[model samples]
Target: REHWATRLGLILAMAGYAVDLGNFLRFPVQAAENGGGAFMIPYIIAFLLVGIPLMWIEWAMGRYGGAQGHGTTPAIFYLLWRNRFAKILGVFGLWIPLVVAIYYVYIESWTLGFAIKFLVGLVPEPPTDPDSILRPFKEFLYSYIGVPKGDEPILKPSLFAYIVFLITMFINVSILIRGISKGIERFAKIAMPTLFILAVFLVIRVFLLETPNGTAADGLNFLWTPDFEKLKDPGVWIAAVGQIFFSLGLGFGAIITFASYVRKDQDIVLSGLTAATLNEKAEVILGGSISIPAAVAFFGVANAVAIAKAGAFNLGFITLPAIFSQTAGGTFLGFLWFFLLFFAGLTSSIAGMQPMIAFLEDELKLSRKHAVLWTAAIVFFSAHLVMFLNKSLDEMDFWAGTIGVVFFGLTELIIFFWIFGADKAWEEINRGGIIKVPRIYYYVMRYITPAFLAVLLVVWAREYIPKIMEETHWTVWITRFYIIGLFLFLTFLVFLAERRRNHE
Candidate 1:
């Protein structure tokens, strides 16, 4: 059965499913770079207006659909929005997760591979030569992986890394294959607790840090000292919303799928609130406490900021590793650190495919076995493009992972609140709730959330859309074409799903 065995299992699984690599690396950088203390003003605003509201809506809609034995966004749309065009738009929810997950699992597998490299002593003890510290980890990342996109000598492919990726991939699909309780639920219980334990341990150790240039206070000030000037920037507000959107696990199929497994008329709002609260604690407390402070207290604020700008992978894989290597028992610390990341990555990745699997079973009447095998077959190849090629991965990350999320989130708000009617949305959200949702959220969910999403969409389009042609390369051009084709191909899967639904 696809049901969660316990309430704790559901909450932990939801938290585990949301706290991906971003919680550790991406979030801290966002908080730091976006005017630190000023960032949280908008961040908290977005959380209340956009993040938690969407979580409640997604859960409410999912529980309703699940009770009716429906499992994907399309089904939720059919029941709530009740139209063909909206049904097509709702498929974006499915599309985002599948596309995002395909490349995302590559990230998970890379972490898996990297962790093993450290465990077996194949990877160098970090702390790159001091002169090399300033070089973007972007330059180092490809070189380390033996992916020959740069001028550096081709670091030979470690068969060990590939084996680990395979193991990671196999484990993820196998978990999804077993359905919810024995597979995802069991893994969540183990992974979530371990993540907290390791994160707390690392935070305590990192607090002892002192840099050549500054101390923990410098990092704290850098992260928290309000730059009221930044509040005037539209980009800051947009970024806060994007982070909230991405971090909350909104716009993905996981919400609906997780809620679908809600047993009977349980208190979904309270459960969702529990999950969101845990994720916030995971992100702000555990995620925030470690990386930036470690970087600022040791390397200096400038270097830390530069590393954050460099990229997420660079921040997690390079900068933090360097910081840890400076400590006593650094190797074990590094091993424990990477393993914590692996657990976080694994739990989230397993949940990523639940929507696709649920959709296949619900819409096409396919067996879980067939749905999983097919998803594995497609994602297997798609992840290779990411594993071997950088350009394609970049495009996919931006379009599928970043932009698609906000766009689909907006779509959800419109469908559930506007088309489906706010009164019913409010009703479903509070159904069997332990805490009564205040009347204010009904307006927030109905109006403010969509407006917030609209602003994000506009800012993203204006800033990013013009760049597709500006970057010079036929190679990149080909990757764009391939990705565009990939999207259309998945859209075609919706057609197949529609055909099957018609027969039913």
Candidate 2:
């Protein structure tokens, strides 16, 4: 059986999930809105209540499934007492990550494009009009993405970003073809350390900058200073919950699939906690320190609020360039920033694709070469729909990324705990674990974990379901059917696996 070449490799792989470059940018947007320091209360509450417990469940569940000769969710679910339909339920776990990778890889390509343009002095000419430095950024972004100048029925795709997108995907599948140790494991060794070094390096440079208008203490305070009154707002809590859920990488398919490669009875418990804690070392300490602080220090808190609200693209892509523009070596620093982003997205996207690859290899018994080709082909083409449709990519993301994750999370918690029996499941978890989990956690999983998840799902549904019903785009329907067809394709393959195993 394939396995991690080293425990260090294993830890870094799991940690890689926690440190998605999106989190690096996403967290700042979140922290900017949730009353800065005050947001931490809800963020921490969600983390303990949802994050840590679910992480344990996924890690334990993955290893258990691995021991049963299953790597993908469907086969694993069937092994959870031969409950055949449980596999259908667990498909969401795989579906989310696979589809997310389809579009996410498209987004990752932009960083490569941004960095290259910066190197050749193509990033942006020094703002000819200084009053709104934002004007030059808008110019490059629209041109880079090929937003039509006039009313054109069909939008021309950004040839620049599209070229980078193909190159990134080529690089992604090529590495996956090399097997885990030589490719992904090797990548983690180089990337995880380098990503942190750059993140830390940027933080230091930002810290050293003279505040354009506000003090550094005030800049940090904008992030950490809690507004007690804001905590009562339901929207704030909802935003905080969404932020924590997406950031921890729970309910995403990759974690469980990665955990499947672990040797039976390996030390996963401490390793799980270490992954969670160390990931935050990057998130709060590193991510929190970067953008919002720089924005507040330079633009003042009021302008920073408007900037963060303009979506992660503006917050991360546009606003940061403006921040760097105020510095002496803005050009070089800008390249470093996007390159660090490139490294982060590259590693995470690789992990995102792993579950689909594992499904083909373990279930269908495809050779590694064939599995990479089939998996890459699905993502490459499906990703084109994301590129083509009118915000249809955004809608498809809701199903593949959000609604699906919560559904499977609730399904797994019940199946593995009450259906599989918490006592037995807990025993399986502690089997190969190095950390002695406190007794209180046993009760937490038994009672509180599901309760918290139930609340989380319900809250998210209230907001998300309405949006789902209201989508009227014809193009989005095409994307939707394609995703459904692809998911079914995966399910059918795994269903054969279940049959073949029985016969064998």
Candidate 3:
């Protein structure tokens, strides 16, 4: 199996895999909308009980499987179970990443397009009319994504955005064609540090702002001041736990694939902890400081809360741009904002594709170039619906990226903790660790983590599944069928791989 060139590069790459646009744009809004700092109560609990344990499990699982000549989850799961059925169970690992990457890459291209447009002065200034202060930015974002404003047809086109999406796809494929260490590792070494630097600059800039509505300190206060009463709300708890998944890249096979490339004897315990902490630093310390604070400072606390409650896209894409447009040196700040998101998205998007690429290489024995070409073909062809069909992106994301991620995490937890034996799995995590994991976590991973995930899944399914089942839109059904088709196709490939192995 290919190995990471250096320990530091491996850690940075892992951190890059975890840190993404969600860190900057989504977390702050989730926090603001969900009891602000009170969200941290369950957030921290979930982090320790669910997120960290999963991180260690995935790292050890990857290392163990990699030593046995496997990188993808399908191969890794079969190794764990030594059963043909296990390979089919692992199809979600392959399906989740590739399907998520389809729309994720397109969304990433939005940041790229914004960064370019801001740099070139293509973005228009927000109107001076107080009555319609946000009109220009709202329109710009809609037009950028080709969302129909009025009576426009169901399918709308944004030619520039489409072009940028193709460019972004090419970039990710180019990186994938490079071997793991040379492509993902080397790129993360630069991207992670630059991502931090840009974030630091934006944080400093935001904190210095003084606006008619509020100061930067006021925004910070709004984010951190706890209303203990909010803790009783189940929605807040659910939001806290759900946000943890995206914040740490838990439930996704990206961590498993990236960790698989580490040297077999590497200190995954320390390495995993470091990456998780670093991601928190980006999400909590840096991400918390940027978009929300800037929005509050410019729009006032009441308006900030309203904008945050609207949606993440409204806050990140539309509201933030409006806030930036009113600032001195707004153009430069806007470029830095979107460009940093571009870098974050680029690093994370490549990680998203690696699990599927590893599947192609490990299971099917495709060459790296061939694997990348095949992956690109699948994503590019499928992602068109995400770009063209109005609700396809949201629908695809809810199934694959949202619900599928949680389902996959629970599957891995069952196999590792129950089927594989928790004691043996615990041993693997500490096999070559710099710092021994605490004994409490043994029980935590074996019991608490599973309970936490089961609750999350049960709660989510009860609330959301009915809504999906009742959906009647043809576009929505088409997307649902598309996800099922990919899942079945991956399962078939796993069966073929198992057959080939038995023939050997």
Model 3, 146-184: lDDT tens digits are 886665335565789989989999999888799788998
Clashing pairs in 3: none
lDDT of each model, Cα atoms only? 0.79, 0.79, 0.86
| Deviating ranges (above 4 Å) for candidate 3 | 128-131, 149-153
Tens digit of per-residue lDDT, candidate 1, span 380-479: 8777666665456667777777788878888888888888888888888898898878888888887788898898888888788778667644566655
RMSD of 2: 2.0
Clashing pairs in 2: 37-223, 37-224, 38-226
Tell me the number of clashing residue pairs for each predicted model: 1, 3, 0
State each model's C-alpha RMSD to the native: 2.6, 2.0, 1.5
In terms of lDDT, the poorest run of 10 residues in model 3 is 148-157
Q: Ten consecutive residues with minimal summed lDDT in candidate 1?
A: 149-158
**Order of the predicted models by lDDT, top scorer first:** 3, 2, 1
- Output the TM-score of candidate 1: 0.93
What residue pairs clash in candidate 1, if any at all? 211-297
